[PDB]
Design a protein around this ligand. Structure first.
Ligand SMILES: C[S@@+](CC[C@H](N)C(=O)[O-])C[C@H]1O[C@@H](n2cnc3c(N)ncnc32)[C@H](O)[C@@H]1O
Ligand SMILES: C[S@@+](CC[C@H](N)C(=O)[O-])C[C@H]1O[C@@H](n2cnc3c(N)ncnc32)[C@H](O)[C@@H]1O
Ligand SMILES: [Zn+2]
Ligand SMILES: [Zn+2]
Ligand SMILES: [Zn+2]
Ligand SMILES: [Zn+2]
Ligand SMILES: [Zn+2]
Ligand SMILES: [Zn+2]
Ligand SMILES: [Zn+2]
Ligand SMILES: [Zn+2]
Lengths: 273, 8, 267, 9
């Protein structure tokens, strides 16, 4: 019986609000170190993001931003966060709206109700070695539906540069449309989210968020739980068909769910008809 | 596209 | 006498910064936007390329003489408690390079003082003769980080045409921070011809040499209740003295009406 | 010099 070993006390090296330990009870692979952990997106060529403070839409709330008059709320029809920072029950989890959080131009206080993602990771997570999907991330506590988990953080790159990246295991498109579109590549520079696996039965969903800038080319990708998550459960999202159409020629899904759509068996059945 | 991309 | 604001920073600093006025009837100043980090109102393209950062390979706490980020200022200037060393040149301070996201070290290394923000308890208060000022609500040892001069980043050419030139801080083709419309607690810090704090150029998350960040450290032990202040320098007083003169009240004052008048009697 | 007043290190 191989022991479970704690192989890193904190993969984030103190950069997150909480430590993120790594364990391995499955094989001899040591703590992954072939990437630089960063807690906020980085750049490796000029992205010319619009950071002009006078361009920000902002609110005039003298409140905690919980009234229907908060402009930042209205830019997504309403503020989607409840009093504990969780997405409302009614939040559209199929096609999420763009969230505009409060920023430095707002009159409100830093602890207003519309600042969840910018406050960082609160839930306790663990990087661990899975049976069949390499590293994964799981919950060390129960997490209610609608809770902010973490952001997909990496190296911001253009569409064209993403097209010639050798390793395409960690590329996340910011926009599904044609033209001047950008991507996060977490291959060389990323946070805990780079270890989050695909599940055909997902428990987290990615949401586009704006915080300190509102350059629409560069939404930040925030993961929220899509249902109550039990202690010990592996986290995962649906990577989507723009991943699997390319990747399924090289490997197939090992998620093991009855609804799996990307296993060898699922793909084989569909080749038949 | 030429590379795999995760996407919302 | 009255607490007129519980926190002028509206929660944006590590600690609250209250405002009091025991002198006159002026309410809490609100003709500016409080921000805790520098802002831009035109395209600056600060170089944020992570591969341009000089960085260390330390897997200790960055207290050794081998830390590269230390060596970029000859040595790390911080001691184990986050204070500038005794020997730190307070007359002509070097540029400080803190550890950054490219360094192998942990976020709690010893070369990350400024980026950790305000730790001392400060108060915005009404002075007798210099309007608002900032003072200490605790003793502060020599070399302790106080706060950063935060504002709107602007070009030299734009700074030349700003109408209000009370809050312009030159960085060093020079850029400036204007804390008139956008600033933090530092915008309220007065000139003293007998100063107790000094401004230092610091680099943290980027190393774009056009845009050092201005950090104030105590230049001696400071007693509870003392007013904080620095020497604004002659690039301020050469222009400003035609409009007003220094009210600091020290015997060493070099910019009072009397001091300036005595010097005109260089005849 | 310059048209406006500048604090400096
Ligand atoms: C973003 S990474 C996730 C972290 C990865 N497991 C690791 O060890 O670093 C994406 C890669 O992990 C693997 N992976 C993720 N989800 C999977 C699944 N459902 N089935 C098989 N492999 C998966 C594939 O190598 C995929 O390209
Ligand atoms: C950076 S501000 C300091 C905050 C200012 N006292 C206030 O109430 O906003 C610079 C301005 O404050 C005043 N001031 C600062 N130091 C002074 C001094 N030693 N003597 C007279 N006025 C001073 C002048 O109006 C100066 O132009
Ligand atoms: Zn609001
Ligand atoms: Zn707002
Ligand atoms: Zn708000
Ligand atoms: Zn599956
Ligand atoms: Zn170091
Ligand atoms: Zn360090
Ligand atoms: Zn370093
Ligand atoms: Zn004086």
């Amino acid at each position: 019986i191989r022991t479970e070993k704690i192989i890193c006390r904190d993969v984030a090296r103190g950069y997150e609000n909480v430590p993120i330990p790594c364990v391995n009870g499955v094989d001899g692979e040591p703590c992954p170190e072939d990437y630089k952990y960063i807690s906020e997106n980085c750049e490796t060529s000029t992205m010319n993001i619009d950071r002009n403070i006078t361009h920000l839409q902002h609110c005039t709330c003298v409140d905690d931003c919980s009234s229907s008059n908060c402009l930042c709320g209205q830019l997504s029809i309403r503020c989607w966060y409840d009093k504990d920072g969780r997405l409302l029950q009614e939040f559209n989890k199929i096609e999420p709206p763009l969230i505009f959080e409060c920023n430095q131009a707002c009159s409100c206080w830093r602890n207003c109700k519309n600042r969840v993602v910018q406050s960082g990771i609160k839930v306790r997570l663990q990087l661990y070695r899975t049976a069949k999907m390499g590293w994964g991330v799981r919950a060390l506590q129960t997490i209610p539906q609608g809770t902010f988990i973490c952001e997909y953080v990496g190296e911001l790159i253009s569409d064209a540069e993403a097209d010639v990246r050798e390793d395409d295991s960690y590329l996340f498109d910011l926009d599904n449309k044609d033209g001047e579109v950008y991507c996060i590549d977490a291959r060389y520079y990323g946070n805990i989210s780079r270890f989050i696996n695909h599940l055909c039965d997902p428990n987290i969903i990615p949401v586009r968020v704006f915080m300190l800038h509102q350059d629409l080319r560069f939404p930040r990708i925030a993961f929220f739980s899509s249902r109550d998550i039990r202690t010990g459960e592996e986290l995962g999202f649906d990577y989507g068909d723009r991943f699997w159409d390319i990747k399924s020629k090289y490997f197939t899904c090992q998620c093991g769910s009855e609804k799996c759509k990307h296993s060898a068996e699922a793909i084989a059945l569909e080749q038949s008809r | 596209k030429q590379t795999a991309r995760m996407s919302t």
